[PDB]
């Protein structure tokens, strides 16, 4: 409800 | 409800 | 509810 | 049983 | 049983 | 039983 | 809800 | 909710 | 909620 | 669920 | 759930 | 849940 | 949502 | 949500 | 939420 | 759910 | 749930 | 839940 997600996982090899 | 998703996974090899 | 997530995991090899 | 309501799953391997 | 209502699944391999 | 309501799961391996 | 399960295995990666 | 389960294994990585 | 489980194993990594 | 009502009797004069 | 009501009786005169 | 009501009786004159 | 689900109504006048 | 779920109503006048 | 869940109402006048 | 109600009058006899 | 109600009057006899 | 109510009057006889 009126929320945001930018990123959950940022997996950089 | 009135929410946003920008990105979940950003997997860069 | 009116919350934000910037990032959960930042896994840099 | 083994159900979901309003959930978010981000499964990565 | 083994059902979903209003969910988001992001499964990556 | 073994259910979810409004949850977020981020499982990484 | 009436449910019967003989055996349940949840494996997540 | 009435539930019956013989055996339950949850393995998470 | 009425529940019956014979054996329950939760393994988390 | 697995319930009983011995008699549902509503009389108005 | 597995309950009883011996008699549901509502009389109005 | 596994409960009883011996008699539900409401009379109005 | 905004419904009458699994209910019993006994209205007398 | 905003519902009547699994309820019994016995209204007399 | 804002509901009547698993309730019994016995209203007489 | 995005509900709007102007006015709700409920009388039970 | 995003509910709005102007005024709620409830009378029970 | 994001609820708004202007005024709630409740009378029980």
Author numbering:
A (entry chain L), B (entry chain R), C (entry chain F), D (entry chain K), E (entry chain Q), F (entry chain E), ...: 350 to 362
Source paper text:
Functional tau is most abundant in neuronal axons where it binds to microtubules, assists microtubule assembly, and is essential for the structural integrity of neurons and for axonal transport. Here, we identify a new amyloidogenic segment, PAM4 (Polymorphic AMyloid segment in repeat 4), encompassing residues 350–362 of R4, and show that it self-assembles into amyloid fibrils. Cryo-EM revealed that PAM4 fibrils are highly polymorphic, and, remarkably, that the polymorphs formed by this segment in isolation recapitulate the conformations that PAM4 adopts in polymorphs from different human tauopathies. In all cases, the folds share a C-terminal β-strand (residues 358–362) but differ in the way they orientate the N-terminus about an intermediary GS-bend (residues 355–356).
